Amino acid sequence: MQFVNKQFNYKDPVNGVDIAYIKIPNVGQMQPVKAFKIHNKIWVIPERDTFTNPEEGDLNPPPEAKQVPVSYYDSTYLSTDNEKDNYLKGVTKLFERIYSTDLGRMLLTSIVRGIPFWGGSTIDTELKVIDTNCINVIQPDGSYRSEELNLVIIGPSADIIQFECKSFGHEVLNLTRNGYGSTQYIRFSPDFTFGFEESLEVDTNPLLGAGKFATDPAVTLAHELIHAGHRLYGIAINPNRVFKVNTNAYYEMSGLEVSFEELRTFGGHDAKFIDSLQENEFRLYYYNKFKDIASTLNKAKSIVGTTASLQYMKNVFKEKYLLSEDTSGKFSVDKLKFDKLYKMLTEIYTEDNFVKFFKVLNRKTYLNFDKAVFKINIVPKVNYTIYDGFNLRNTNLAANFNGQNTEINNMNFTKLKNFTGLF
Ligand SMILES: *SCCCNC(=O)C[C@@H](CC(=O)NO)c1ccc(Cl)cc1Cl
Numbered sequence: 001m002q003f004v005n006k007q008f009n010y011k012d013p014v015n016g017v018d019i020a021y022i023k024i025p026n027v028g029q030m031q032p033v034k035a036f037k038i039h040n041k042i043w044v045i046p047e048r049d050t051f052t053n054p055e056e057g058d059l060n061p062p063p064e065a066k067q068v069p070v071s072y073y074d075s076t077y078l079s080t081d082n083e084k085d086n087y088l089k090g091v092t093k094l095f096e097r098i099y100s101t102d103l104g105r106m107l108l109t110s111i112v113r114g115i116p117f118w119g120g121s122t123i124d125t126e127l128k129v130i131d132t133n134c135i136n137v138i139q140p141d142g143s144y145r146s147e148e149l150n151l152v153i154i155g156p157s158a159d160i161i162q163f164e165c166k167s168f169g170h171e172v173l174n175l176t177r178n179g180y181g182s183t184q185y186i187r188f189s190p191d192f193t194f195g196f197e198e199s200l201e202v203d204t205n206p207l208l209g210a211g212k213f214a215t216d217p218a219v220t221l222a223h224e225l226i227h228a229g230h231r232l233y234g235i236a237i238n239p240n241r242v243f244k245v246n247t248n249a250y251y252e253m254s255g256l257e258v259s260f261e262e263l264r265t266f267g268g269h270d271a272k273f274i275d276s277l278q279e280n281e282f283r284l285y286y287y288n289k290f291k292d293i294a295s296t297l298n299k300a301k302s303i304v305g306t307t308a309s310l311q312y313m314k315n316v317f318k319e320k321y322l323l324s325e326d327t328s329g330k331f332s333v334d335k336l337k338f339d340k341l342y343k344m345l346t347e348i349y350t351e352d353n354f355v356k357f358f359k360v361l362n363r364k365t366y367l368n369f370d371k372a373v374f375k376i377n378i379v380p381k382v383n384y385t386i387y388d389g390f391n392l393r394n395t396n397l398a399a400n401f402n403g404q405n406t407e408i409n410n411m412n413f414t415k416l417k418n419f420t421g422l423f
Helices: 081-099 100-113 215-233 249-254 260-266 274-301 310-320 335-348 351-358 401-406
Strands: 019-023 033-039 042-048 136-140 144-148 151-155 164-166 184-187 194-196 242-244 257-259 372-375 415-417
Touching: 033 081, 042 081, 081 100, 081 215, 100 215, 100 335, 100 351, 151 215, 164 215, 184 215, 194 215, 215 260, 215 335, 215 351, 242 260, 260 274, 260 351, 274 310, 274 335
Parallel strands: 042 151, 151 184
Antiparallel strands: 019 033, 019 136, 033 042, 136 144, 164 184, 194 372, 242 257, 372 415
16 A cells, blocks of 8 residues: 555645645744645655744854754755755655555554644543644634644754754643654654764764765664654653763763663664663653553543544543553453554664665664765656665665665765865
8 A cells, every 4th residue: 555645746726735835833933834635644845944943044054063064054955945846855755665565564564543632621530632732724714623643744944964863842741752642743854864984883983984884864764753753752862861871982072972862772782781680670661651541541431522533532542551441340451452653663673674675785883974965856766766775686786785885876975065074
């Protein structure tokens, strides 16, 4: 099957269902952006993210200076209708590449099922939505109807190559750390990709290599779906917990620290840097969060809104958290099923495992050094496909990851900025 049924053109007419101008809730004030609902609970906004953060409203560089050498600034990127057409087609292409594998089909199903928890009530007997987990669609009559959604694919802000997850917070709840979840905004662009070196000693060295191979953007997107996956199930490790990298003397020299959440998202040998004592403290911590989600679903006897039933919403949240619906009318947690789902989101959905499915050359660790960033156009099938990416089959590019070879497949890549030396 396809993940995206409709092949969207950016200049397609607005219908108010899956092609419409929309407003982001807690983005202070904004003018409407044309958005595309490519799947149930998944929208794509082909715009530079001048919205989610009040501090990121411009696309120019600030007084900021000698802090980020791994950065790239172009205020004209993603400003024309043609770029927006290729952006949304590039995101759509990468989403089918992720859907093309069993691992991606499982992560995408886990993402679509991960409805953010209805925990905005202040009465225990009432199940109410959290109002910033929605969007405001303009419908054909001209008015605004709010609609729940899980995932948003947004363009980057001023710093083009700094992809990251974003989500609005509560005044009290920590939505990505309390099992609730929250609508995730992924700053992403399919028009750029990073370089990396094939030898480990070179890739982890901040002084060697120009970036001979390029990262498959399908891996980069899937990396971010994994973060949003944990964040949509409220099991994200607090970004204050970081690991003091003592396996890279260049890292030790600068005191560079790497978060537990990203080491987990990459997986491989990196996810073993979490020593088993705090790995178990997290599972026990989030086990309790799942259970008073079950206790809250037990306390509730009324439902706010008119969109759906109380019966339907309780079934949604014992489907998301895999709670046990016995016949006491009360919901429970099965530690075995909780571990089955907690391990799936954390260990099964990793950047390293997606590499095994794509049969793709990739960075062997997250504790490396970015080397270069290229300009790419993966829209034309002569350049990139759903099933192969850059290594087109029955062609000199299919062998030896030659499609990702920026020197052998040189017309698919144009280097824009070197990161070697600036470290
Ligand atoms: S959902 C959070 C995504 C986090 N982003 C990253 O970890 C780094 C990304 C791109 C970025 O934001 N800044 O460089 C990245 C960079 C290089 C490579 Cl080879 C892969 C990836 Cl995923």
